[PDB]
Amino acid sequence: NGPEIMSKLAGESESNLRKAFEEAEKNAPAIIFIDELDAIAPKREKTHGEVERRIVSQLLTLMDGLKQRAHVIVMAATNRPNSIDPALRRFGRFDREVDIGIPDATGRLEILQIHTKNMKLADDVDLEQVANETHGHVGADLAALCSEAALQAIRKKMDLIDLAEVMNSLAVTMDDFRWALSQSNPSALRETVVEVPQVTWEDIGGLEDVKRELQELVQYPVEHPDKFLKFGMTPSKGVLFYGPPGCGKTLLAKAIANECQAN
Amino acid sequence: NRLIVDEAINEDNSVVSLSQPKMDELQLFRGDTVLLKGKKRREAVCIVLSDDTCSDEKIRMNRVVRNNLRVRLGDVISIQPCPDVKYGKRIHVLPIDDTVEGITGNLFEVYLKPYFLEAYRPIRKGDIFLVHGGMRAVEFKVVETDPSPYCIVAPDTVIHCEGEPIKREDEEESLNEVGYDDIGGCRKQLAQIKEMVELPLRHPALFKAIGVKPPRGILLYGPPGTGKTLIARAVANETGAFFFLINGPEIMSKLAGESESNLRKAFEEAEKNAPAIIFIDELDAIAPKREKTHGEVERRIVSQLLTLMDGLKQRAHVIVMAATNRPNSIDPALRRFGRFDREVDIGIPDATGRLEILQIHTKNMKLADDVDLEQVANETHGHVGADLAALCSEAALQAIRKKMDLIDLDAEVMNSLAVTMDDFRWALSQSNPSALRETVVEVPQVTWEDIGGLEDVKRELQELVQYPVEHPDKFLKFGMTPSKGVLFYGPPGCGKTLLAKAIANECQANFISIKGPELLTMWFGESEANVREIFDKARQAAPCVLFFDELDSIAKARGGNGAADRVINQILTEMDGMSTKKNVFIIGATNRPDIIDPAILRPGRLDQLIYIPLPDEKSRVAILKANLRKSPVAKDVDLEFLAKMTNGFSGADLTEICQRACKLAIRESIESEIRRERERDPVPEIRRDHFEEAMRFARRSVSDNDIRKYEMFAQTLQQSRGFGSFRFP
Numbered sequence: 001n002g003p004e005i006m007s008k009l010a011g012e013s014e015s016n017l018r019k020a021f022e023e024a025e026k027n028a029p030a031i032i033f034i035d036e037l038d039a040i041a042p043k044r045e046k047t048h049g050e051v052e053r054r055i056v057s058q059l060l061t062l063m064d065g066l067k068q069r070a071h072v073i074v075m076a077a078t079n080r081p082n083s084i085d086p087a088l089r090r091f092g093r094f095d096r097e098v099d100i101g102i103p104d105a106t107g108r109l110e111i112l113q114i115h116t117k118n119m120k121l122a123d124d125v126d127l128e129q130v131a132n133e134t135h136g137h138v139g140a141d142l143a144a145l146c147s148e149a150a151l152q153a154i155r156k157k158m159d160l161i162d163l164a165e166v167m168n169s170l171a172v173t174m175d176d177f178r179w180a181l182s183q184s185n186p187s188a189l190r191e192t193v194v195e196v197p198q199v200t201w202e203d204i205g206g207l208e209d210v211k212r213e214l215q216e217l218v219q220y221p222v223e224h225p226d227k228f229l230k231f232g233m234t235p236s237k238g239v240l241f242y243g244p245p246g247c248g249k250t251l252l253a254k255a256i257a258n259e260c261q262a263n
Numbered sequence: 264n265r266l267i268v269d270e271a272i273n274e275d276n277s278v279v280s281l282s283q284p285k286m287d288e289l290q291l292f293r294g295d296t297v298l299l300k301g302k303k304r305r306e307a308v309c310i311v312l313s314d315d316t317c318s319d320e321k322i323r324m325n326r327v328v329r330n331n332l333r334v335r336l337g338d339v340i341s342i343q344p345c346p347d348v349k350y351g352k353r354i355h356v357l358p359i360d361d362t363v364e365g366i367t368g369n370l371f372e373v374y375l376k377p378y379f380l381e382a383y384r385p386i387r388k389g390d391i392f393l394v395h396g397g398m399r400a401v402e403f404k405v406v407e408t409d410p411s412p413y414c415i416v417a418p419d420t421v422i423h424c425e426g427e428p429i430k431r432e433d434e435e436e437s438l439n440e441v442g443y444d445d446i447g448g449c450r451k452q453l454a455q456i457k458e459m460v461e462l463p464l465r466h467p468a469l470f471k472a473i474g475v476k477p478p479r480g481i482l483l484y485g486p487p488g489t490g491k492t493l494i495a496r497a498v499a500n501e502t503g504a505f506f507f508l509i510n511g512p513e514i515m516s517k518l519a520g521e522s523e524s525n526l527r528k529a530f531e532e533a534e535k536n537a538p539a540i541i542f543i544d545e546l547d548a549i550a551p552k553r554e555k556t557h558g559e560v561e562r563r564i565v566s567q568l569l570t571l572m573d574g575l576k577q578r579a580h581v582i583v584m585a586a587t588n589r590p591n592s593i594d595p596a597l598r599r600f601g602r603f604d605r606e607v608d609i610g611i612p613d614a615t616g617r618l619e620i621l622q623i624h625t626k627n628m629k630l631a632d633d634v635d636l637e638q639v640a641n642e643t644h645g646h647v648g649a650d651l652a653a654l655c656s657e658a659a660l661q662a663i664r665k666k667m668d669l670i671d672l673d674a675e676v677m678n679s680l681a682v683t684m685d686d687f688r689w690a691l692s693q694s695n696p697s698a699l700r701e702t703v704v705e706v707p708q709v710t711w712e713d714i715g716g717l718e719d720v721k722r723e724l725q726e727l728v729q730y731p732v733e734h735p736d737k738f739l740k741f742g743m744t745p746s747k748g749v750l751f752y753g754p755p756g757c758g759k760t761l762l763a764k765a766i767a768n769e770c771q772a773n774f775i776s777i778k779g780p781e782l783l784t785m786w787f788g789e790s791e792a793n794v795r796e797i798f799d800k801a802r803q804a805a806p807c808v809l810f811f812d813e814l815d816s817i818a819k820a821r822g823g824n825g826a827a828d829r830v831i832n833q834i835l836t837e838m839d840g841m842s843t844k845k846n847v848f849i850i851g852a853t854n855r856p857d858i859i860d861p862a863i864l865r866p867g868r869l870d871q872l873i874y875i876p877l878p879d880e881k882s883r884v885a886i887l888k889a890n891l892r893k894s895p896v897a898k899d900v901d902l903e904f905l906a907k908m909t910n911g912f913s914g915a916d917l918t919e920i921c922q923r924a925c926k927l928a929i930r931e932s933i934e935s936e937i938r939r940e941r942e943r944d945p946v947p948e949i950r951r952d953h954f955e956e957a958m959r960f961a962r963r964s965v966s967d968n969d970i971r972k973y974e975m976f977a978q979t980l981q982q983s984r985g986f987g988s989f990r991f992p
């Protein structure tokens with residue numbers, strides 16, 4: 001972990017950072033993970049001090065110290081891309097960039113079966129409409145929700161003599177789940193959702209010509225790439241929507257991305 | 264000694280072919296001790312005069328000195344007599360590639376002794392040659408150095424057996440072969456690099472004809488992510504100087520006191536070695552701008568580095584190179600003209616740079632005979648060499664993803680790889696352009712007949728910008744300096760961009776284009792130094808055409824909420840400060856001409872206000888020929904009737920007509936495909952019904968009263984003509 005290196009004194013920051021890198025000299029199939037590297041390598045002008053620059057410089061030096069010798073893999077935990085300074089994440093040197101985002105309703109559902117496959121539910125909850133709601137919720141908060149549900153399963157039992165009467169058969173209800181949700185709070189709120197929503201296109205009727213150019217626009221740049229390249233012109237970059245302020249909040253573009261299985 | 268080479272015959276260095284009439288022409292000494300030279304400063308000694316299999320004037324060398332000292336077969340082989348060397352005592356027991364493939368045993372009796380005919384290895388103590396008994400593919404690096412120079416050894420004395428295997432990475436780790444061809448098309452500035460390093464290139468003799476060397480110190484300027492390690496290593500193994508690269512964070516990692524260690528020691532050994540070229544990788548970490556710097560150890564480190572720069576004795580042509588992301592990122596004290604004065608710009612690669620950047624990385628593969636690589640090149644607009652390297656990497660990764668997990672290594676996909684055009688196009692979609700939002704310094708493609716216009720109107724521009732570049736004596740005999748800038752105006756001027764691009768096409772000069780929102784970004788960001796940096800890099804991008812699109816964007820922005828502004832005053836500052844030479848030319852586009860600046864019509868700045876009218880029926884044939892190019896429109900189309908129907912449309916409107924006809928054609932083609940699939944040859948020919956229905960999507964975007972406004976502006980262009988044409992003598 002990065003704060004292990006940060007917690008040591010000056011001069012000992014070289015210790016427990018290179019030491020894993022010659023420990024990876026022993027093991028040819030190996031990976032190297034640094035947790036919370038935003039505290040390790042933030043913006044250089046943001047830091048007030050010199051030891052942070054020492055740690056950043058020695059990490060950049062030991063990045064290419066194993067130049068395809070042991071073929072080790074470096075992965076890291078970044079809260080934001082702009083937290084990392086652009087000098088460290090330049091191309092060719094620690095630059096492969098994928099993301100995680102937030103899980104969808106099916107992802108929250110699978111998180112719920114993962115966290116409930118060990119415990120014993122009271123097999124009466126639906127456990128699907130619950131995951132369909134809780135928008136902007138981390139799965140860690142879903143684990144906390146399950147923990148609060150088990151805490152309510154303890155709590156509805158009175159002060160007994162500490163024997164497995166309720167402990168052997170944990171009883172959870174949907175109202176218990178809702179009240180544990182009520183005594184909770186989201187932390188993934190006010191973030192841009194990247195998941196595709198569904199309205200399944202039947203809810204909008206009429207405007208069939210508008211449906212015809214909407215199926216013209218986005219349905220087949222990747223569905224018909226070579227057929228669109230018969231003429232050679234580019235697809236239309238932008239479309240502007242105008243009209244009365246009525247039935248115009250959302251979900252039309254969500255539907256027209258939902259036939260394309262697009263985010 | 265400069266002569267052509269023969270092809271390979273055998274696979275042993277202990278037998279070498281011979282050309283005896285060419286040795287009759289030349290002077291070469293006996294047998295085992297003959298020097299051959301060439302690339303990477305590598306002197307090598309082996310046998311000649313032994314086989315005589317081939318003909319005259321071409322001689323076979325061994326394959327391990329075919330790949331070393333040259334690039335491939337058909338090169339220029341050179342010979343040199345290097346006789347009267349001493350006798351060594353049992354060079355290497357230690358091989359370096361394939362010890363574990365087999366048994367060790369006595370570690371030198373096993374492979375050297377069945378494979379020699381009294382050729383006692385006069386090779387460099389550290390050089391390679393494949394030698395084994397049965398499998399015959401074991402290299403070596405020599406650790407036994409009983410003779411110092413290139414010497415044969417005595418027959419069969421005794422040594423130790425400390426040979427241990429290492430992975431075969433040392434030759435491309437320390438003596439990695441790079442040449443002029445090994446950088447993907449940087450010959451705009453690679454020629455400048457070769458000009459700058461030619462006086463360091465083993466030449467003290469012209470130093471008295473040069474006075475001081477113009478390379479006191481060279482700065483490489485390039486985008487973050489283009490890489491400069493192999494670019495700085497190009498002069499290594501082509502000059503033979505001691506490279507000794509040191510990284511910036513490598514210096515910053517060690518503590519103070521030790522920070523001066525291996526920093527001034529590098530320069531101290533740089534006077535110890537007579538050929539020396541020094542390179543600093545990412546000196547911006549060492550030397551930023553001083554306002555971003557903090558503390559005392561960083562200032563002391565940059566002070567030590569600057570005393571190393573000023574402590575140059577100007578001896579033995581010791582040159583320092585550096586890796587700059589931006590010239591403004593480094594400290595401005597280093598740009599003084601006593602050291603680190605000469606700046607050379609790598610820049611971003613163009614479409615042809617993307618074209619011949621790719622064969623170097625795709626040497627070690629096999630195409631599926633379908634990629635022409637022109638359809639890989641210009642679709643990656645705003646990419647860089649790291650983008651193409653990662654593109655090839657994850658294209659091969661996608662090809663491996665197509666392969667199922669059925670591996671015996673078998674050798675059905677890895678030996679013969681099938682990265683298709685679909686694989687490269689899927690790779691090209693999943694890209695990450697680090698060179699996005701970087702202005703291109705390159706020559707575009709319009710080539711003068713995309714739009715017709717009036718050719719004499721463009722011909723005064725042809726006289727204005729092309730002929731001062733072509734003829735330096737154009738205005739020297741009888742005249743003075745021509746116009747620095749010409750701005751066009753009137754309608755939405757996409758065709759003005761085409762004219763500026765074709766003007767850049769004729770001169771093969773650079774085309775830097777600045778957009779209206781690009782200037783509004785500096786207008787609302789309150790950072791006026793960006794325009795100065797743009798003009799400063801345009802000075803080094805000479806010759807170039809500076810295009811500003813929508814100069815009245817600031818006028819339209821201030822109309823929503825004084826005509827002079829902060830960004831146009833910096834424009835007037837640089838362009839009044841622009842020299843009377845260097846052929847930097849300005850092209851302006853403006854929708855509303857009279858409202859932007861009363862001071863822009865003053866002479867000294869610019870005087871030409873060449874207006875172009877709305878495109879008419881003569882240029883509609885040219886725009887429809889542009890429709891004919893790159894698009895399979897069929898015959899029986901009445902372009903004269905189309906130009907009859909375009910009463911007042913624009914060129915952008917007629918390209919929109921092309922787009923609506925494209926939309927009709929592609930939607931009816933996929934509808935024909937859908938009913939063909941529903942029934943249980945895409946017909947690319949396009950008929951008159953496409954244009955007949957696309958004509959219903961045609962409205963004059965330009966205002967009809969605005970043409971009256973344009974001729975009211977041209978009433979100012981209407982002069983004070985009248986009587987007075989009296990006499991020409």
Ligand SMILES: Nc1ncnc2c1ncn2[C@@H]1O[C@H](COP(=O)(O)OP(=O)(O)O)[C@@H](O)[C@H]1O
Nearest residue numbers: 241242243244245246247248249250251252253
């Ligand atoms: N189904 C739709 N989805 C998204 N935007 C729409 C839809 N229908 C109309 N619009 C656009 O939205 C605008 C009006 O939105 P409005 O009705 O004010 O939003 P709300 O429904 O939140 O009141 C119109 O200009 C129209 O072009």
Ligand SMILES: Nc1ncnc2c1ncn2[C@@H]1O[C@H](COP(=O)(O)OP(=O)(O)O)[C@@H](O)[C@H]1O
Nearest residue numbers: 092445446447489490491492493494648649652
């Ligand atoms: N202009 C170029 N020509 C050839 N290769 C390039 C170019 N730019 C980048 N590369 C490739 O990018 C990779 C990493 O670049 P880096 O090692 O940072 O410096 P350099 O670009 O000088 O090699 C190298 O493998 C190199 O081949």
Ligand SMILES: Nc1ncnc2c1ncn2[C@@H]1O[C@H](COP(=O)(O)OP(=O)(O)O)[C@@H](O)[C@H]1O
Nearest residue numbers: 713714757758761878886889913914915916918
């Ligand atoms: N004479 C012409 N007038 C206008 N557009 C033309 C002409 N000839 C070709 N074109 C094409 O029309 C396109 C216009 O698109 P563009 O100007 O990029 O849109 P925008 O102004 O919104 O950026 C250009 O890509 C160009 O290739």
